[PDB]
Amino acid sequence: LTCVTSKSIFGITTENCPDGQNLCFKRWQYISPRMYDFTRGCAATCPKAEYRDVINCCGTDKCNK
């Protein structure tokens, strides 16, 4: 599995996920009422987000682009 790890106007950076990591993720991390921080990459499991966070996972190449 290959996942996107960063994206902008320049394009995307991708990573061939390590062994056992067969999901891509997108995560919104609550920082404060007016701020969320965004990450995306490879994962082994799709953890349940704690309150105020959102985590979405998928299992096909570059699905988190």
Author numbering: 1 to 65
The paper states:
The three-finger toxin (3FT) family is widely represented as structural motif, mainly in the Elapidae snake venoms, supporting various biological functions. This fold is characterized by three adjacent loops rich in β-pleated sheets emerging from a small globular core containing four invariant disulfide bridges. Despite high primary structure identity, often greater than 55%, muscarinic and adrenergic toxins exhibit distinct pharmacological profiles and clear functional differences. “Loop grafting” has been used to construct seven chimeric toxins to dissect how the affinity, selectivity and functionality for the muscarinic and adrenergic receptors depend on shuffling loops between various toxins.
Three chimeras were obtained by substituting loops of the MT7 toxin with the corresponding loop from the MT1. These chimeras were named MT7-1/1, MT7-1/2 and MT7-1/3, numbered for the respective grafted MT1 loop. Loop 1 of each of the three molecules in the asymmetric unit of MT7-1/1 superimposes precisely on that of loop 1 of MT1. The loop separates from loops 2 and 3 as it does in MT1 but to a greater extent. The grafted loop 1 of chimera MT7-1/1 preserves its structure as in MT1 but does not adopt the same relationship with loop 2 as in MT1 nor keep the relationship found between loop 1 and loop 2 of MT7. Thus a new toxin with novel properties is created by the grafting. If MT7 is compared to chimera MT7-1/1, least-squares gives an rmsd of 3.13±0.02 Å while by SSM gives 1.4 Å. On hM1 receptor, substitutions of MT7 loops 1 and 3 by those of MT1 (chimeras MT7-1/1 and MT7-1/3) have no significant impact on the toxin affinity, suggesting that the seven modifications associated with each of these substitutions were not involved in the high affinity of the MT7-hM1 interaction. Notably, a two orders of magnitude increase in affinity for the α1A-adrenoceptor is achieved for chimeras MT7-1/1 and MT7-1/3 by the grafting of loop 1 or 3. These toxins are characterized by an affinity close to that of MT1 for the α1A-adrenoceptor.
